[PDB]
Write a protein that binds this ligand. Structure first.
Ligand SMILES: Nc1ncnc2c1ncn2[C@@H]1O[C@H](C[C@@H](N)CC[C@H](N)C(=O)O)[C@@H](O)[C@H]1O
Length: 243
């Protein structure tokens, strides 16, 4: 496991979390590198840590730095993949174990209540999720319900011990107005898969060899030679409504 040792990254994450509202849930709290600074935001906090011995040590540390028994942070010894997320508004934050990143992201994207997620993960994953240099199939598949932001790059030297690759700080925000109804999620995500894996050179050829009016692409501001990665969230949703 790679614990966050760079205090500047801690300050940066706390700065982003401080601009949000409501209760906070932290994934992989560890020794409390983020938990202790997050508790000073005076908001309700739940810190999740799968190592029970480490979770008990963290519960003592959070209580010691808290105003006292009468006033704070609940430390839960649990696997976040099995943790029931509340359906009420909350904010999620975490330094994710790099081998469980996509499973944790899947669990969060299908989960309720949370309005913002502030997550530390592998740099290549955070880059693809934030659509740096164009969107990937997974980003476009979640775009009607969420927005992704790349806050910063984080060197492997900012962790102890050092991971094999660098990291990225990713923000995710739940759209208050979804672009596609959640009931149509599986058909929407199937269409996005079909376009990213379809044969053809460019959108005009891809949409031809697929099970769309020929005037549709240019009327929606899409160049016929464009690649699926160049489409915006609004264009994917218009394509879903069309098909
Ligand atoms: N599935 C899980 N659910 C909740 N915690 C996890 C899970 N898997 C790993 N853990 C913990 O996730 C943490 C991930 C670490 N990269 C960071 C820990 C901590 N925030 C620190 O920076 O001090 C480790 O403390 C792991 O023990």
């Amino acid at each position: 496991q790679n614990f966050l040792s760079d205090r500047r990254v801690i300050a940066d994450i706390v700065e982003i979390v401080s601009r949000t509202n409501g209760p906070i849930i932290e994934i992989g709290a560890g020794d409390g590198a983020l938990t202790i600074p997050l508790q000073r935001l005076a908001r309700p906090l739940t810190a999740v840590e799968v190592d029970a011995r480490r979770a008990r040590r963290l519960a003592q540390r959070t209580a010691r730095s808290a105003p006292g028994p009468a006033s704070p942070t609940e430390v839960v010894a649990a696997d976040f993949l099995r943790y029931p997320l509340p359906r009420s508004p909350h904010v999620v934050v975490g330094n994710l174990p790099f081998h469980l990143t996509t499973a944790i992201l899947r669990r969060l994207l299908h989960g309720p209540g949370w309005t913002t997620a502030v997550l530390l993960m592998q740099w290549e994953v955070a880059r693809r999720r934030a659509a740096v240099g164009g969107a990937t199939m997974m980003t476009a598949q979640w775009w009607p319900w969420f927005e992704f932001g790349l806050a910063r790059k984080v060197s492997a030297a900012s962790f102890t011990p050092r991971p094999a690759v660098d990291a990225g700080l990713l923000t995710i925000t739940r759209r208050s107005r979804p672009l596609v109804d959640v009931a149509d999620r599986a058909r929407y995500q199937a269409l996005v898969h079909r376009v990213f894996t379809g044969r053809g050179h460019g959108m005009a050829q891809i949409l031809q060899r697929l099970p769309v009016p020929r005037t549709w692409l240019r009327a929606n501001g899409i160049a016929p030679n464009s690649l699926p990665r160049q489409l915006s969230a609004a264009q994917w949703a218009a394509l879903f409504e069309q098909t």
